[PDB]
Each structure stands twice: as C-alpha cells, then as structure tokens.
C-alpha cells in the first residue's frame, strides 16, 4: 500500500524498530523498453525509457558513454529531443575514474554532430553546461543541458538530502513539459534519483508516496542505506 505524506514519518519509525528490520526485510524483498536507434553504416548504445509521474518514457537511464558510445549518446540526446542530462558523479572519484568526459571543452565533432560548450554556471554542489548540438544536413541548433551533481560522497548516501532536492527541484524547473526524456546517466545513484523525482510528484499531487511499489517496479537501488535515504529525503521535502 502506499503511505500517507502526513504519516510518513510514523511509518519511517515503524520501519526503524527492531533495529531497522522493516527497511531490511523490504529492500532484501526486491531481489522492451529500449531506446531505439536506427543503426548507421559501419552493438549499439543500451539505454532504457523509465516511466515519470506524469508522463511515459520521463527519463532515459543509460550506463554512462565509454568513449566508443559518445556519437551514439549524442545521436540519442538529438533524435530523442532530449534537452536535458542528468549526471550524479564526479568524474574522478577518490582517483578512480568514474565517467569519461562525453562533452567538449569547447567544441568538437561526434561523427555528424558538432557539439559546442556555450555556457558553464557553476554551484558549490552542482554544474549547469549548456551545448549547443549542431548536425550535418540540418539548418538550427538543438539547445540541451547537463545538471551535474558532484556533492554525492563516494562512501554512502549525502548527510543531508537538502542540496541533492534542491538539485533535483533545478532540473524539474528547467525542463519544460514539451521537453524530450531526461537522460540520466554515469552505483545505485541514478535509482535514488529517478525515484526522488516520481515520488515529490506524487506527494504533491496526491499527498501520498509508493516508494516500495516504485522501486520494485524499477538503474536499482545498491543499497539498504540508499533505500532509507530515499524515505529521508521525500520527509525532508514534505516538510511545508
């Protein structure tokens, strides 16, 4: 069943009692839809649509490019319409390298698409690039965002879910609603993500959340602790 927002915090306590067994024994309880590109002249790109709140194929989740998928991505970003990506790592991680760098310094050329960087607005927790993608045969310039989230500690879930909602509050409002799917991208992280952004939309509209049912019908969650994170962050934002 789904939970009431105004009982949220009872049924958070509830799952916390014997310590924490209810979270445990519903996480350990978890254990067609793919983008189609028409091949080119020469495996391609495995990405997925996920369903939003509001509206089918919301997202686009995809294992971030290798650097031999990085015109394929692109392809995908400029027949899907999608205008905006979402990325939530560093790309070095503790020296590990985490993602590979998909996107120009300035400009470059992907195959047939010449992609250029026409703006960088940069926060103490996340990154906002603007690209201009421009492709042969084609008279205008397609306009598309990348919301990098960087503040997500490389050990567990953030201490406070407060930026990464705000995060995630920044890219529902610069997405419009004629928008392609959100290409989430490059751990468990993507999940926490995709299920924050369904769940606040049905806590506002219906002043309810179905975390358990939203995640079991999902890109999975990695761990218990993100799975508690989840019901942390939307009690954060029911608040008010």
């Not at 009872?10 to 924490?20: L, V």
């Not at 993100?226 to 608040?239: G, R, S």
């Amino acid at each position: 069943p789904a939970v009431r927002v105004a009982d949220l915090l009872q049924h958070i306590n509830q799952m916390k009692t014997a310590e924490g067994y209810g979270f445990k024994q519903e996480y350990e309880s978890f254990f067609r839809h793919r983008v189609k590109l028409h091949p080119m002249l020469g495996d391609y790109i495995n990405a997925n649509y996920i369903d939003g709140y509001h509206r089918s194929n919301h997202f686009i989740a995809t294992q971030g490019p290798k650097p031999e998928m990085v015109y394929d991505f692109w392809r995908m970003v400029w027949q899907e319409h999608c205008s905006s990506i979402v990325m939530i790592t560093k790309l070095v991680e503790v020296g590990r390298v985490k993602c590979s760098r998909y996107w120009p310094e300035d400009s470059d050329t992907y195959g047939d698409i010449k992609i250029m960087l026409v703006k960088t607005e940069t926060l103490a927790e996340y990154v906002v690039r603007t690209f201009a993608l421009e492709r042969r045969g084609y008279s205008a310039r397609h306009e598309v965002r990348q919301f990098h989230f960087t503040a997500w500690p490389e050990h567990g879930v953030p201490y406070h879910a407060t930026g990464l909602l705000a995060f995630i509050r920044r890219v529902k409002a610069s997405t419009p609603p004629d928008a392609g799917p959100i290409v989430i991208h490059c751990t468990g992280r993507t999940g926490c993500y995709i299920v924050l952004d369904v769940m606040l939309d049905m806590a506002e509209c219906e002043g309810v959340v179905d975390i358990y049912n939203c995640v079991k019908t999902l890109n999975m969650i990695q761990t218990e602790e993100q799975y508690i994170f989840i019901h942390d962050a939307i009690l954060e934002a029911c608040l008010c």
